Amino acid sequence: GSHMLEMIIKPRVRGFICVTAHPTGCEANVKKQIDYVTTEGPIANGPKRVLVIGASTGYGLAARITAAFGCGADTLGVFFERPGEEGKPGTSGWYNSAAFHKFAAQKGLYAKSINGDAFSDEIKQLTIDAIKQDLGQVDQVIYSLASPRRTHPKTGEVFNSALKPIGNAVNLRGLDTDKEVIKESVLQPATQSEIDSTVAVMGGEDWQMWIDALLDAGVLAEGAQTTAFTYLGEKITHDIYWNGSIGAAKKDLDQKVLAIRESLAAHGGGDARVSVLKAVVVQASSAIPMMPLYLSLLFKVMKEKGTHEGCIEQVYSLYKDSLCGDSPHMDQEGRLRADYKELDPEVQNQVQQLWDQVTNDNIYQLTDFVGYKSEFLNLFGFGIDGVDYDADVNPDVKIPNLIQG
Numbered sequence: 001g002s003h004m005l006e007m008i009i010k011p012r013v014r015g016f017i018c019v020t021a022h023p024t025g026c027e028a029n030v031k032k033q034i035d036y037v038t039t040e041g042p043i044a045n046g047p048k049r050v051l052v053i054g055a056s057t058g059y060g061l062a063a064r065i066t067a068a069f070g071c072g073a074d075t076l077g078v079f080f081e082r083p084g085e086e087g088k089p090g091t092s093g094w095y096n097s098a099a100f101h102k103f104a105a106q107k108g109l110y111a112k113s114i115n116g117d118a119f120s121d122e123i124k125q126l127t128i129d130a131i132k133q134d135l136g137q138v139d140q141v142i143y144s145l146a147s148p149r150r151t152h153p154k155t156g157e158v159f160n161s162a163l164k165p166i167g168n169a170v171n172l173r174g175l176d177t178d179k180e181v182i183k184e185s186v187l188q189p190a191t192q193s194e195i196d197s198t199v200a201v202m203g204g205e206d207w208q209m210w211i212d213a214l215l216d217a218g219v220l221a222e223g224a225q226t227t228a229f230t231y232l233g234e235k236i237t238h239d240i241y242w243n244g245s246i247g248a249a250k251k252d253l254d255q256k257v258l259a260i261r262e263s264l265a266a267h268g269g270g271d272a273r274v275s276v277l278k279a280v281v282v283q284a285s286s287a288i289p290m291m292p293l294y295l296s297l298l299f300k301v302m303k304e305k306g307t308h309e310g311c312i313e314q315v316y317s318l319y320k321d322s323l324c325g326d327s328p329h330m331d332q333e334g335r336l337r338a339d340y341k342e343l344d345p346e347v348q349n350q351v352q353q354l355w356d357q358v359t360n361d362n363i364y365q366l367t368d369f370v371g372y373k374s375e376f377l378n379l380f381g382f383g384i385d386g387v388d389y390d391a392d393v394n395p396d397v398k399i400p401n402l403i404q405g
């Protein structure tokens, strides 16, 4: 019988990483984000043909949902995910994208996806072909890539990004989510090679290659728009994201966008912006001990002010207010800001005060570690309402219109 091909999927955590995902729960999570967008209402004057680079999880998935179900856009998505198979659940991003194709088709929306290395020339060429065959051109390009490594499309060199400070070693407090102990560790300052590598991986070169491979193709509409997602944060994380190796990468983004805006604004009044979003739980959060503690504190503080939100709420506002509306939130460098509720002085002062009082004993009285754990499990499709986690499921979920690179 088919029970031999099905299985009961449960959370399995190895190395602060959940190595399983639940297809039914992932589908329920995507539908929850779709339902939020539709309940909030349509978004006027948004793009109608959208390319989302990094479209399977987190903010990129939220952008695909907002564009599709908020602006009514046909969406082409690029991601790097593992399909499921007998006895081996695929990645959450695979099941999320399967659900997106299903729900998009129900609403008569075009949904095609490409699975492969977005840093490579091959994948850029497949994406170009897809646009030529189906859409003609795209109005908006969302760059939402997060990877620890990058294979250079020319030299073949493999760059690995580093999460380290610059100048002086730093003592970072954090929360070990396997042991549930508050703990500190010292990070050494990044070497020059580590900094260049992080710029190469998380900088803006690949975003630039995408736009310049699409422009000479040519598949960008008049008034075309593009934005890249980033995080700046405040003092608690500044040793890494302001001044650290990743801060060096974000400094790269800030200058490469200038070249992109120049090229687009001559092309029908288009526009390009770095968009700064708030911190959220992602698949890799528990692997950096600082973020679980910061997010747990931030969640409690913001919940007490009625300002807590996740990916789909952040990105729905970015579209409605800044990318397509007339409530844009520019900053001195020319970045779009949607993180202002996280950076509110009273929130950060309260997170900082608590940051110095949390111990192993009072974690659940001072932080929303409960909420962090729930949202973390939700990423992989676990703990979702309405899902019968006792039922067998076939982990081999297929995706129509999925180009395998």
Ligand SMILES: NC(=O)C1=CN([C@@H]2O[C@H](COP(=O)(O)OP(=O)(O)OC[C@H]3O[C@@H](n4cnc5c(N)ncnc54)[C@H](O)[C@@H]3O)[C@@H](O)[C@H]2O)C=CC1
Pocket: 053, 054, 055, 056, 057, 058, 059, 060, 078, 079, 080, 081, 093, 116, 117, 118, 119, 143, 144, 145, 146, 147, 228, 229, 230, 231, 276, 277, 278, 279, 280, 281, 282, 283
């Ligand atoms: N997580 C956070 O708190 C914040 C993240 N951001 C930014 O948002 C953007 C999205 O990242 P996140 O959503 O955090 O994590 P994420 O892991 O949720 O999403 C990463 C996406 O990139 C895709 N991807 C990774 N390597 C790839 C490759 N080689 N080829 C093709 N696709 C590949 C994945 O399939 C996935 O769709 C990033 O630029 C990040 O810096 C901005 C503010 C806060």
